[model samples]
Target chain A: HHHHHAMWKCKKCGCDRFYQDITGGISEVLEMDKDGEVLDEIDDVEYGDFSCAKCDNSSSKIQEIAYWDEIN
Target chain B: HHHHAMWKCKKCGCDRFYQDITGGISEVLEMDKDGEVLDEIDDVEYGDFSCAKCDNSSSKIQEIAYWDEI
Candidate 1:
């Protein structure tokens, strides 16, 4: 499984005012069995949106944000 | 866009008790290539977490992990 740490910041200010951690990437979906058990998991995903709290510059679209992997 | 919440007991080092607050299964992520909101994926659902081991309930909510579904 892959873990990603991401943030959303104002494009104008470039300050990471908002943040999020996503386990799965954008194109990946969860597949479950009839018993609701997770069957397939693809963690290699990317891309999300964020708005600047200080400037209120909400992202109109997702950008190439930075992220780190969780080593455990 | 989702959050995972967990409660830890500072007194006993207990870190397993947790709960899902936002109840979001999948989220729409923005594609980096086109900067468009496309594709569906699983993420985290955040919520308040309380430690039952030492009865030390968390005063603030914390995030744990992100997932699409349970």
Candidate 2:
């Protein structure tokens, strides 16, 4: 999957180099109640960790340039 | 709550010359395993904006500050 959602750069070296890691996961599941009415489901999710490659600078924070669903 | 993030040139520190609509709102509802309602989540999706002065489009480390009043 093309998981490139954000960009990270090194301020010290002025390099726009970075990498990402899947630190966690998130999902949503739905189930029915006693009355058969549908209810919302929730799950704990994972986040991506991004780090700059040039200057020993790493940040878990990233900004979204675009969404996956919005690209297509 | 304030909802704005800024983009500026790292070399020249020129911030007034650039702007971009780069963030989004994500609303999520939390529920238990039994499908019971728990809470609502409103998240602010930050954007990766670019600077015009130095034309630096890379991500820079900075604290996201908010205003007391708009």
Candidate 3:
């Protein structure tokens, strides 16, 4: 099994680079995954948007935008 | 608590953000007091180039850049 960056991909440009503007703090146990765990992309992220670097309708509203935990 | 970002450092003029060309694996644990935890720092990883601009840095949610996440 090859360990890859499993990061979320952009639905539009398909690029993986992004900057997420976060106002809330969500607890994510990733590379720090210990004791017991699972998953590549954790969801239900609130008060934030997973704005893509290449393609996004975000500009219609405002401007915005990791590895380890990849997106499938 | 929240975490934010700092732009390129004035010191080296290097990008504040980076992707480690070196894919090494390192682990960090920060625990708070009384059965709580504080060490879930999002940035510090194994193959970064010291995101800390210097002994000094800045951000909202105010964070000290990891000396190794550049």
Which candidate number maximizes DockQ?
Answer: 1
Q: Report the TM-score of chain B alone for all candidates.
A: 0.31, 0.28, 0.21
Instruction: Give per-model CA RMSD.
Output: 16.0, 20.8, 18.1
Residue A31 alpha-carbon offset, candidate 2, angstroms: 23
TM-score of structure candidate 3: 0.23
lDDT of 3 by residue, A1-72 (tens): 222314434445655444333333223222211211112222222223334456752321122221233334
Model 1, residue B37: displacement in angstroms? 17
How high is the lDDT of residue B6 in model 1? 24
iRMSD, per candidate, in listed order? 14.3, 20.6, 19.0
RMSD of candidate 1 to the true fold? 16.0
- On DockQ, the stronger of 1 and 2 is 1
Q: Which regions of candidate 1 fall more than 4 Å away from where they truly are?
A: A1-15, A20-34, A43-48, A60-72, B1-70
TM-score of 2: 0.23
Candidate 3 chain A: worst-modelled 10 consecutive residues by lDDT: A29-38
Worst 10 residues of 1 chain B by lDDT: B61-70
